[PDB]
């Protein structure tokens, strides 16, 4: 036929069985059968989200026609997926595309058993536009309105709005049949019906756990894609991996690994070494976080809730306010958590909230609204979380934001949602949201409290917690703090912890001297002198960073430039010895290199 | 082919002739592409990375894996074609002539049956004969991409996937995003070692193993608008080109002087006259700053800490508050420090904070947020 | 080719089709001083719409056919390239750039062409507003090397909005400030245009009709500018003679009564100022002659160059000021009540004088 040159006989494909089985969709195919059985507008357009099975409904109608499960006023009518692109292809002269389209419409009147399926019906606007020739839809619009042409369309809900609703005469001539995104229970039945086609292709076996896994894990962990497709994507790609094993089962673990490789979200069943890494999670965060055990335990419990599968699936993995003194490791734990979960601190989404000074810098988080500049960019926060859904999002210096930027982030905490300016909801349900505040210490740090009171050393931490938690309640709306999973007021760094900070900060200096063919030994008397002179009980470890800079580095940097300590072994012994005790501010370090 | 050679280039034939660079590492990413290509419904991976993380290299590494037979036996000896959509549009002055050429390509896929298309810059598929609500190259492929009748690797950046592929949300459905991550420094050194013979033969230099380390480490440190497996290669090639214009070896100092010319950050091996400039640095600042010895020492300790390589890489070089009475050399030491480091007072970035007494002039520092004048 | 987007001003000069310019020959010398440069020989005539900027290069084109130019400007042909005409009729991709390259091809071919791009602010934003190739990015290579001599002409606002904001474009063009004339400069402009009028309109124009066209257009017209709105009054004066021949000063006062709308045309009406103020105010006539008295000094006699035309304290009150505005230049609606009872605070002081930028009440 000439109709075979510009289309695909879709009931001939259903008779040959090269259309996939369409399980469910009884109400949607029956609805198409109603609209095709009309007399005025015989034209259903299947509108739905991309991937919900709009093309599947028609190729399930094609199977219903072949199997005789079709009305008698629709019996033995052959569906033709009209390729509009093949109608255009070759139409270099005036009135070729029109002649081809009128010739296609002749073979629908003469045969009388044709139903066109114009997939991507929005492409019917155009397709004959050469500005010396008329439109493709303008040829069809007389025959669509009077029932003279039975045409199924299929368009996404976006492209129906963008291109069909902006031609209200064409929109009028089609009946919008909603093809909804199926439920998870409907998607499992789709995957059980498609089970044969993916087992036969991949030479695998797909256990019923893997259908339940593919529909549940795709509905939970994917938000840019739709169910009767993102669950098929997990079945198809996991079945492809088991074929690549032999270059036979696909089960629950095989689906979760594909979902893990795709989203980035670890949901897969665990090795023994990765399970025991999560039990040593506190002990491995304490390789970088000296002290701060309340907060190291708190972020470890949030990660272990997620990897046990006990996370509330409508909420983030953890919402934290790291509060307390300045320099005690609030940002540094957010770094150490991101190094634990990923291997670097560049995987930390660090939103520095001091850059947010009025309400309208919240447009940096979720992007500009429609009609305004920078609408093409979806915001700094909503993109970085849409690329990496499993993330640690640090809102550093959260009290320095304007108070109306928390209100953007309220439903990030409770729902795991932040709809950007473009309108895409971003999944925050797998992020660890860490808020960092200095509230209640950006002053109280200074020792002594207005008035009389007992104790100090552990009752100034209870004074710290009461001061911080009251400054949080003063600064934040109570519905923000209601949605935080754990508020951890941090400890001031004790004298014994500043000793262990010296081991941690000389290791940065010694790690740089490895690149200079040097080594840096730091004697244990020199660890104590840095630890005294660096100990402020109310700042902690950032004054120690200054003392290691002033006394080790600034003296060692000239010794390198003098070439007096080139590729050797800088020992750094103390000399006045500061008697090892009492003040040691008459003591001095000496740097000598050997070997 | 005959019709597919006009509209693309055979990438596996380029791998047989060894005209592709060695793609070392990226095993988990090439395997992931082969897992997607071995599907049946949508066997269309799209490589979603950042510019220069090696997205085109993953497919060029795939084309080398096809030639070597390190590919699955459902993907064995499939000729890969980088589809040049500019070559498809070129010509096509008449209606359907673009749609002819794409349907001739797609018919050539089905007759041969051993073709993987590689639409590099897959965002260019969105609109190639007309707009999105008309017959473009995307709307012709979308029936065949959705049913596994066409194996097509795409590769866009993260921005081009947002701005163009997600704005055609039906086409995004047809592709399976394989995220190509930016490599680590340890992985980039392995990339640079594998690419050594290509650049030490084009430049006729000898790039030492330390220069591979000093390219990947220094590009990850000091370059912040580019990505690792390209910005470390930029240091390797331009230092190899530095050496060829001296006509035998690309050392650490050859890499670091190329980064010094490109960033402006002096990280190179200090000459002995420049080393003694930094030990006399206090005395050079006292030619402009009378007195203020504790202040001249402190900014000289910060610059000597930077040029000795003892700077914290997560901190600025120095972070000073010059406090004190008016007219004793607070602004003048900042000007003298910029004269020492650059020979210019105009090299000093004076952010005069008396203009910032408003709460809202913070936007003069970091710009306006999206939706505002001063966002451009 | 180049005749399809503008006329040859040099060929119009030697055919006598151009109005002679009297004065602004220091402006013409400044434009020759730009055009005789080597590297960026592109003047932009900065003015405001009607001061005579086409008239500057109309006088430059007359200076070429008179041979009063440098040797780098002799036998040059000026073309008023309308770049809006290049945009017009251009619906397609590449259709715009084709008829700009046809223009630039005749620059290379002839070599003696000086383009006069009137409305040079249009040069930014002819294809894509610098997002892609516009007419600016096509010209900017040749403008920077002196291989394309181009006289721009734009308003000082439009030079700042479009040409100064493109910092690459502002160095290619050299601002020639064409100021608005004085009234005594406008009269000697219209002396040389008397020959152009009397040949066309079949009129004879007396001496003070120019004086009553230049002083009077400065007095009542502020939207338009001097060496154009005064040409307009002598134009519309013969347009009453086409209804009918010597024009008067009343002939110009007639045609400004058409234009602005006021028929009042000061020593006579200033003396019996009181009677035209009694026509809306009867009763309290002592204050009527009091506010008549001081204004008989300010608008008749001696006046400081920096003072308002009388300042009063009223302690009908506002009905007299409305009748005072009606005598003032001829309109009832010139009275603006500020309602100072609607302001009591210090931050509301910026709600009637203008806001500092950034803040509420900027308009």
């Amino acid at each position: 036929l000439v109709l075979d040159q510009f289309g695909r006989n879709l009931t001939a494909a259903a008779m040959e069985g090269k259309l996939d089985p369409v399980i469910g969709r009884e109400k949607e195919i029956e609805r198409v059968m109603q609209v095709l059985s009309r007399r005025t507008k015989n034209n259903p357009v299947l509108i739905g989200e991309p991937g919900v099975g709009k093309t599947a409904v028609v190729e399930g109608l094609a199977q219903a026609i072949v199997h005789g499960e079709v009305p008698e006023t629709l019996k033995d009518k052959q569906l033709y997926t009209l390729d509009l692109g093949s109608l255009v292809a070759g139409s270099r002269y005036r009135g070729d595309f029109e002649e081809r389209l009128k010739k296609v419409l002749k073979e629908i009147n003469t045969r009388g058993d044709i139903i066109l399926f114009i997939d991507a019906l929005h492409t019917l606007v155009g397709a004959g536009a050469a500005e010396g020739a008329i439109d493709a839809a303008s040829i069809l619009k007389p025959k669509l309105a009077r029932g003279e042409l039975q045409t199924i369309g299929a368009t996404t809900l976006d492209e129906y709005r963008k291109y069909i609703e902006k031609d209200a005469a064409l929109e009028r001539r089609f009946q919008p049949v909603q093809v909804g995104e199926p439920t998870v229970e409907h998607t499992i039945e789709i995957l059980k019906g498609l089970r044969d086609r993916y087992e036969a292709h991949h030479r695998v076996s797909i256990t019923d756990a893997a259908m339940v896994a593919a529909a549940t894990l795709a509905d939970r962990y994917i938000n840019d894609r739709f169910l009767p497709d993102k669950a098929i994507d997990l079945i198809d790609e996991a079945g492809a991996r088991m074929r690549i094993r032999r270059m036979a089962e696909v089960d629950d673990e095989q689906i979760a690994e594909v979902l893990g490789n795709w989203t980035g979200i670890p949901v897969f069943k665990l090795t023994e070494a990765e399970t025991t890494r999560l039990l040593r999670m506190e002990e491995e965060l304490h390789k970088r976080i000296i002290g701060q055990e309340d907060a190291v335990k708190a972020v470890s419990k949030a990660i272990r809730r997620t990897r046990a599968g006990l996370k509330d699936p409508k909420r983030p993995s953890g919402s934290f306010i790291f509060a307390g003194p300045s320099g005690v490791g609030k940002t540094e734990l957010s770094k150490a958590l991101a190094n634990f979960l990923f291997g670097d601190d560049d995987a930390l989404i660090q939103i520095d909230m001091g850059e947010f000074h009025d309400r309208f810098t919240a447009s940096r988080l979720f992007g500009a609204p429609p009609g305004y500049v920078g609408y093409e960019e979806g915001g700094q926060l909503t993109e970085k979380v849409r690329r990496k859904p499993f993330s640690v999002v640090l809102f550093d210096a959260i009290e320095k934001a304007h108070q109306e930027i928390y209100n953007s982030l309220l439903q990030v905490l409770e729902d795991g949602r932040l709809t950007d300016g473009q309108g895409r909801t971003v999944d925050f349900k797998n992020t660890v949201l860490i808020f960092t505040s200095n509230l209640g210490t950006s002053d109280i740090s200074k020792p002594v409290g207005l008035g009389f009171s007992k104790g100090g050393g552990e009752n100034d931490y209870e004074r710290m917690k009461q001061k911080v938690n009251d400054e949080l309640k003063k600064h934040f709306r109570p519905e923000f703090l209601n949605r935080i999973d754990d508020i951890i007021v941090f400890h001031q760094l004790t004298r014994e912890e500043i000793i262990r900070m010296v081991d941690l900060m000389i290791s940065r200096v010694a790690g740089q001297l490895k690149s200079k063919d040097m080594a840096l030994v730091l004697t244990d008397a020199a660890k104590a002198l840095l630890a005294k002179r660096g100990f402020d009980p109310v700042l902690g470890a950032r004054p120690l960073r200054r003392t290691i800079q002033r006394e080790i580095e600034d003296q060692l940097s000239e010794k390198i430039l003098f070439e007096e300590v080139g590729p050797g072994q800088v020992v750094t012994v103390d000399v006045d010895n500061w008697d090892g005790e009492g003040p040691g501010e008459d003591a001095v370090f000496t740097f000598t290199g050997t070997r | 082919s005959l019709v597919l050679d006009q509209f693309g280039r055979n990438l596996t034939a380029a791998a047989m002739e060894g005209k592709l660079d060695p793609v070392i590492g990226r095993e988990k990413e090439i395997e992931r592409v082969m897992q997607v290509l071995s599907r049946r419904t949508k066997n269309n991976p799209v490589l979603i990375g950042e510019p220069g993380v090696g997205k085109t290299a993953v497919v060029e590494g795939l084309a080398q894996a096809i030639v070597h037979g390190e590919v699955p036996e459902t993907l064995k000896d499939k000729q890969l074609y980088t589809l040049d959509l500019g070559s498809l549009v070129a010509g096509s002055r008449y209606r359907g002539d673009f749609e002819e050429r794409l349907k001739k390509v797609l018919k050539e896929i089905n007759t041969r049956g051993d073709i993987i298309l590689f639409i590099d810059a897959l965002h260019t598929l969105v609109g190639a004969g007309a707009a999105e609500g008309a017959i473009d190259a995307a709307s012709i492929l979308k029936p065949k991409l959705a049913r596994g009748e066409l194996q097509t690797i795409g590769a866009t950046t993260l921005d081009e996937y947002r701005k163009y592929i997600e704005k055609d949300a039906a086409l995004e459905r047809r592709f399976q995003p394989v995220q190509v991550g930016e490599p680590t420094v340890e992985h980039t050194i392995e990339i640079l070692k594998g690419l050594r013979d290509r650049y030490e033969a084009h430049h006729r230099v000898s790039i030492t193993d330390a220069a591979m380390v000093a390219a990947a480490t220094l590009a990850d440190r000091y370059i912040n608008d580019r990505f690792l497996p390209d910005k470390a290669i930029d240091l390797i090639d331009e230092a190899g080109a530095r050496m060829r214009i001296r006509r035998a070896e690309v050392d650490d100092e050859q890499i670091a002087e190329v980064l010094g010319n490109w960033t402006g950050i002096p990280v190179f091996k200090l000459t002995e006259a420049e080393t003694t400039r930094l030990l006399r640095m206090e005395e050079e600042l006292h030619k402009r700053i009378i007195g203020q010895e504790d202040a001249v020492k402190a900014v000289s300790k910060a610059i000597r800490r930077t040029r000795a390589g003892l700077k914290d890489p997560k901190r600025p070089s120095g972070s000073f508050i010059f406090a004190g009475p008016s007219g004793v050399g607070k602004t003048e030491l900042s000007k003298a420090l910029a004269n020492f480091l650059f020979g210019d007072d105009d090299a000093l970035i004076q952010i005069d904070m008396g203009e910032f007494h408003d709460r809202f002039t913070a936007s003069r520092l970091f710009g306006a947020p999206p939706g505002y004048v001063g966002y451009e | 080719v180049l005749d399809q987007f503008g006329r040859n001003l040099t060929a119009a000069a030697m055919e006598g089709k151009l109005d002679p310019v009297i004065g602004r020959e220091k402006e013409i010398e400044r434009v020759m001083q730009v055009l005789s440069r080597r590297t960026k020989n592109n003047p932009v005539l900065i003015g405001e719409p009607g001061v005579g900027k086409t008239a500057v290069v109309e006088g430059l084109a007359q200076a070429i056919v008179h041979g009063e130019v440098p040797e780098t400007l002799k036998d040059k042909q000026l073309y008023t390239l309308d770049l809006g005409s290049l945009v017009a009729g251009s619906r397609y991709r590449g259709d715009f750039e084709e008829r700009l390259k046809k223009v630039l091809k005749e620059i290379n071919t002839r070599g003696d062409i000086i383009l006069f791009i009137d409305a040079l602010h249009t040069l930014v934003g002819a294809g894509a507003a610098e997002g892609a190739i516009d007419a600016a990015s096509i010209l900017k290579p040749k403008l920077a090397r002196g291989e394309l001599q181009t006289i721009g002409a734009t308003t000082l606002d439009e030079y700042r909005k479009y040409i100064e904001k493109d910092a690459a474009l502002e160095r290619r063009f050299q601002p020639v400030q064409v100021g608005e004339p004085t009234v005594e400069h406008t009269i000697e402009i219209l002396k040389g245009l008397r020959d152009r009028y009397e040949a066309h309109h079949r009129v004879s124009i007396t001496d003070a009709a120019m004086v009553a066209a230049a002083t009077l257009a400065d007095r009542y017209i502020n939207d338009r500018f001097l060496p154009d709105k005064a040409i307009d009054l002598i134009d519309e004066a013969g347009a009453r003679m086409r209804i009918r021949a010597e024009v008067d000063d009343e002939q110009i006062a007639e045609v400004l009564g058409n234009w602005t709308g006021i028929p009042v045309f000061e020593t006579t009406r200033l003396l019996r100022m009181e009677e035209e103020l009694h026509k809306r105010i009867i009763g309290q006539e002592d204050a009527v002659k009091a506010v008549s008295k001081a204004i008989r000094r300010t608008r008749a006699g001696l006046k400081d160059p920096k003072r308002p035309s009388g300042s009063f304290i009223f302690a009908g009150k506002t009905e007299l000021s409305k009748a005072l505005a009606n005598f003032l230049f001829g309109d009832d609606d010139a009275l603006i009540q500020i309602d100072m009872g609607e302001f009591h605070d210090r931050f509301t002081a910026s709600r009637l004088f203008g806001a500092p930028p950034g803040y509420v009440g900027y308009e």
Partner: peptide, 23 residues
């Protein structure tokens, strides 16, 4: 104290288009 709202327009995108010959 008050925003400005740049409010980016969209453009018409001056178009290439295929045409139709006839012999």
């Amino acid at each position: 104290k008050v925003l400005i709202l740049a409010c980016l327009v969209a453009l018409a995108l001056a178009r290439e288009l295929e045409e139709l010959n006839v012999p």
